Amino acid sequence: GASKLRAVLEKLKLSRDDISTAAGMVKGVVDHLLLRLKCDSAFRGVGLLNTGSHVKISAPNEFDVMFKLEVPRIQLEEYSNTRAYYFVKFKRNPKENPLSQFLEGEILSASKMLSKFRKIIKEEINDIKDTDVIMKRKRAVTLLISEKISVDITLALESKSSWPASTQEGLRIQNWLSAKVRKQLRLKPFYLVPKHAKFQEETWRLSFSHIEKEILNNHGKSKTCCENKEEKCCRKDCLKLMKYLLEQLKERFKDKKHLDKFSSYHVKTAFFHVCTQNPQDSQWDRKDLGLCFDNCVTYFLQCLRTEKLENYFIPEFNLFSSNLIDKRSKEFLTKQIEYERNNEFPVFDEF
Amino acid sequence: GASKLRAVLEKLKLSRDDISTAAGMVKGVVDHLLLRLKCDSAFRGVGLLNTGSKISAPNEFDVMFKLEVPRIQLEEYSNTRAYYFVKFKRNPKENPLSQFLEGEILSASKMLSKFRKIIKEEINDIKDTDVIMKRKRGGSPAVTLLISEKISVDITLALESKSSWPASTQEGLRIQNWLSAKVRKQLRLKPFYLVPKHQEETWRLSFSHIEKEILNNHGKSKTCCENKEEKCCRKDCLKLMKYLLEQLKERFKDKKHLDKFSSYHVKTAFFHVCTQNPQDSQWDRKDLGLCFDNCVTYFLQCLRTEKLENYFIPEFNLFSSNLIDKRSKEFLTKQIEYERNNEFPVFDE
Ligand SMILES: Oc1cc(-c2ccccc2)nc2nnnn12
Ligand SMILES: Oc1cc(-c2ccccc2)nc2nnnn12
Ligand SMILES: Oc1cc(-c2ccccc2)nc2nnnn12
Ligand SMILES: [Zn+2]
Ligand SMILES: [Zn+2]
């Protein structure tokens, strides 16, 4: 039964037009912040990474923006055999490095880097008069435009180097998107977002947000997938429904605090794993949406039970490790998803 | 019947290993010429566009030398949708090619002369191999070298423009139902080249790079020719069409009719057949004989009707009566039809 699923997708599609006006407010504020950030020597080569402007299917008043900063000849040192967290050290000596001010030894400080970023942003939001902009407290930088629109702003270092060795056996798209696409994609840059690891406040985590967008917007085995009536698939619709399932349950149990650790990234990672399992476009037929979404729900639940959700790019990194998410939280999310699946998804009818 | 076709392809595949040694000699000479060419102010940003990787000629290599030109303005010559005059848009800073300006227009002749002059000067200086420069024949194959008395290298100069493709290409590259519209959008965002081809002041459009991309990523499916269940015969049909023309051109070299026909005509016609048959199922390995017969058949229709449109410039007809006379197309038709009727005797060896 896909009827109620297709009904949800149409209701979600009705929020599309309002996202245009809201994006206009965000484009204004972000263009301003990038003009003022480019004035500082450190953040001179700062730019917009070119994806979002949504990241929450039930949130037109929520936008995510990424600010790329190209870093020239960098050396990475993997922190404590975590295949995702690294220390950013510099390789060349000439000429003087613009980020020298944030070096806490030979290692670039994430904390000192993000503090200056937060400081310049706090300073420039008071000077912008077009709209009312407030900066939200530490929980990278979240703004609130005209008391409605929230903007999550991330700083990401860009490296045009070859991807770290931890990614060598990841991105298993060879039997789905082809090995020739995998070769082309790995030649693209990689990003590092400042994220500390279990209290190491000097580490950076790998980011492949750009590759995830490429793979989602060119998602079929066939190059003409979703370009004609005979080749329409339900891949994107399954992801939208999985994302919405978690958002609705997270909203339902916001006062409980269990589901706070789960994100749309867990849903998206699990979705790419199901795409690797079902490489044929015939396995994603529009008529089979109900059955396709049930495999996605089912795979996601297996990851929760087995406490195993590997990062799509870093196979050895487990997003569902007991050290990251406690078993009782995964058991609560399992309980809730199973109830929903057993009662024809009541949480879809805004519950 | 594909047996004799598959046999020819295996014999052509046996020339592959010798092409490695020969390419080594060419990589040496070309890397030298590019190092010396980069010394001149005009040809500073010169680079190789990478063709050094005729199906019956391992002692014959073609190389393209790209040169990026910044803010160029094109003026279409006499409603030819392929020939253009190269002008420059901005004023600051001074243009490195100012020496070749024959008015506000960049001279092809003055540009190619300096190119031929630096190349003639550097072939005498380079050691460890005997290199001779062959005399003028055509404007498109611009400078021809002869390494160690065996290897011929055709060196072409091409201007690179990162601008949007001219309006004459707007309705070309009909790969939307085969390679997808999203690929067509990605491909058109790439640069375009202009090779000096004459009116001895014009430049012709070149999309050699797009032809290579389309040939090396040729299926509807992204995994086409990456597994036993997805092996196609597209490349093999092109290799056989190219070899059919080369063998007939050799046979009638003393007659002079087929001199105007090139592998580009065969390749253009092949891309038109790919547009007609967008499905990988239409190019099954088992159906090679039937696939090659459609290619032969389409090519013959173009010869009879005197109509072979450029794959990128629809309004440009490569088989125009003004380019190739009717009696020459009729001779090539006669010969191809005889070959097809007698199980291709020109193939066997
Ligand atoms: O782009 C990303 C990346 C990651 C991430 C987590 C663990 C290891 C590696 C990468 N998590 C994320 N959560 N939201 N976005 N997002
Ligand atoms: O790349 C090309 C392009 C052309 C060509 C001919 C007529 C109009 C436009 C372009 N002809 C060619 N012959 N060999 N290569 N090659
Ligand atoms: O080599 C040939 C060629 C032809 C032939 C016929 C019509 C037009 C052109 C060529 N016919 C032939 N009959 N025997 N040999 N043979
Ligand atoms: Zn699709
Ligand atoms: Zn193929």
Residue numbers in the entry:
A (entry chain A): 161 to 213, 217 to 302, 307 to 365, 370 to 522
B (entry chain B): 161 to 213, 219 to 363, 371 to 521
Article sentences:
Although DNA-binding compounds may indirectly inhibit cGAS activity, to our knowledge no inhibitor shown to bind directly to the cGAS active site has been reported.
Cyclic GMP-AMP synthase (cGAS) is the most recently identified member of the family of cytosolic DNA sensors.
